[PDB]
């Protein structure tokens, strides 16, 4: 009974149109609780997740200010960057930040992240021992340099190892009756035809949560993975995920087909005839 | 909560 | 209101242990400090928490409890010298507000 | 590290004065409070950056302005029997990046006098 807490920021460059966008989304798991967006109107801190409407004025007066900060530095960071590289002020450009923590079933630390891309790429990332700096190019450099100076590691590592995991706990608690759920996937499977030969079976995983699930076609021990389809885990709208596979065989050779429905909300792995 | 230190690249 | 040090008129006598305690009311601190001020002076920064629990790099020993939300710092060999009040500080973030205690007056009397 | 100037002054109501506050450290958040007795240190105004400044829990009796990044003149216009007190004037990085830790200047300190 693992979870954990990250935060995903955005920021996106607007060539001649103005500021660049600030998106901030926080999530504990696979739900998300809290956002903020350059765009929207009330320019602060926004719940997502009616737990964390309990919190007061001190915490989203505190969570609205650093929001801000963040968007401050990263409104910088296009700009350093594109002297950087030297890329013309006519494209738009992308930056994106990811940080927090992970506790295991005892809740305690177990992980702690921090990566910063620029225009889709690993720009700089914090290593697994929260005292190092991976840069993945010259320019990157630079900002490795600079950021070994200003003790970014020491402040993070103290983040990610403390307080990120105390919050997390704390918010565990709160969101109790939606946090710590963990719904089944409600399993079957369909058959559509292609021709006097050709069928194609589809299994089928939905309203389950959390989203990690692996659904796997087998031959009776073997991998009939290699050719079929698997889609990406989509949301359902309502908190749970949904998913499924399927595979082509010439209408007959399909009773001896498995399906290997994986989830955590499963005592043993499910298996499937039809 | 949000981390309270960030700084530029 | 948002910071309470203990107890103002104080005293301590030589080589002794000098126990000042803090605390806090906005759970969503996240750095904590210990200023000295000797009188008609400014106050110097001693100490710096960032993680809770005991650092102790002197002869200085600060202790944080989150979960308390509660600020110490003990000084373990007292000298005359250390006869100063004490201020206590908290903020949230690079851009939140220090916050101080109305100080706690030490005396290290000989 | 932070300076700041006069060190004292003694004043009459209705003169104006301005205390000089500089930092080394490229700092971006500086700061000024007056310490009084009864009240221990107590906010006047701030600043985060160059150009930027705003209010504090006792803005009224003072002006203030932040052209550069290392100056942050706080200025009494007419001065006040009240604003006897001593003064700080305090930096922090801010944005900047580095030891979240805040540093004081010595401090000047004022007597106003009808």
């Known amino acids: 009974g693992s979870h954990s807490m990250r935060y995903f920021f955005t920021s996106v460059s607007r060539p001649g149109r103005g500021e660049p966008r600030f998106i901030a989304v926080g999530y504990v798991d696979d739900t998300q609780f809290v956002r903020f967006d350059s765009d929207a109107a009330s320019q602060r801190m926004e719940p997502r997740a009616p737990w964390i409407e309990q919190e007061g004025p001190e915490y989203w007066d505190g969570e609205t200010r650093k929001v801000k900060a963040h968007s401050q530095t990263h409104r910088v960071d296009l700009g350093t960057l594109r002297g950087y590289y030297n890329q013309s002020e006519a494209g738009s450009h992308t930056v994106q930040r990811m940080y927090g923590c992970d506790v295991g079933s005892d809740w305690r630390f177990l992980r702690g992240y921090h990566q910063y891309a620029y225009d889709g790429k690993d720009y700089i990332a914090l290593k697994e021992d929260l005292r190092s700096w991976t840069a993945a190019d010259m320019a990157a450099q630079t900002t490795k340099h600079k950021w070994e100076a200003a003790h970014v590691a020491e402040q993070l590592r103290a983040y990610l190892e403390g307080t990120c995991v105390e919050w997390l706990r704390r918010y565990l608690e709160n969101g109790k009756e939606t946090l710590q759920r963990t719904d089944a996937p409600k399993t079957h499977m369909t058959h559509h035809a292609v021709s006097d030969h050709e069928a194609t079976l589809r299994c089928w995983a939905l309203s389950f949560y959390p989203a990690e699930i692996t659904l796997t076609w087998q031959a009776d021990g073997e991998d009939q993975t290699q050719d079929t389809e698997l889609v990406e885990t989509r949301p359902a709208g309502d908190g749970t995920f949904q998913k499924w596979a399927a595979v082509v065989v010439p209408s007959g050779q399909e009773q001896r087909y498995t399906c290997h429905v994986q989830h955590e909300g499963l005592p043993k792995p499910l298996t499937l005839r039809w | 909560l949000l981390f309270g230190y960030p700084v530029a690249v | 209101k948002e910071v309470e040090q203990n107890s103002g008129p104080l005293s301590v006598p030589e080589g002794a242990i000098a126990s000042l305690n803090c605390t806090y009311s906005?759970?969503?601190?996240?750095?904590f400090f210990w200023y000295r001020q000797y009188s008609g002076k400014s106050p110097e920064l001693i100490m710096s928490i960032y993680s809770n629990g005991d650092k102790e790099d002197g002869r200085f020993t600060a202790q944080l409890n989150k979960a308390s939300q509660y600020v110490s710092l003990l000084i373990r060999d007292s000298q005359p010298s250390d006869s100063a009040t004490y201020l206590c500080?908290?903020?949230?973030?690079?851009?939140?507000?220090?916050?101080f205690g109305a100080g706690t007056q030490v005396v290290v009397t000989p | 590290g932070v300076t700041q100037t006069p060190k004292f002054q003694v004043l009459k109501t209705g003169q104006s004065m301005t205390l000089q506050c500089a930092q080394d450290?490229?700092?971006?958040?500086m700061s000024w409070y007056r310490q009084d007795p009864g009240m221990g240190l107590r906010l006047i105004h701030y600043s985060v950056g160059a150009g930027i400044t705003d209010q504090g829990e006792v803005p009224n009796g003072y002006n203030v302005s932040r052209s550069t990044t290392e100056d942050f003149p706080l200025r009494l216009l007419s001065a006040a029997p009240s604003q006897t007190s001593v003064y700080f004037c305090?930096?922090?990085?801010?944005?900047?990046?580095?030891?979240?830790?805040?540093?004081f200047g010595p401090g000047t300190r004022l007597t106003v006098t009808e």
């Open positions: 500080a908290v903020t949230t973030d690079s851009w939140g507000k220090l916050q």
């Open positions: 305090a930096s922090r990085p801010g944005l900047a990046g580095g030891r979240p830790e805040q540093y």
């Open positions: 450290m490229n700092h971006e958040y």
């Open positions: 906005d759970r969503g601190s996240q750095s």
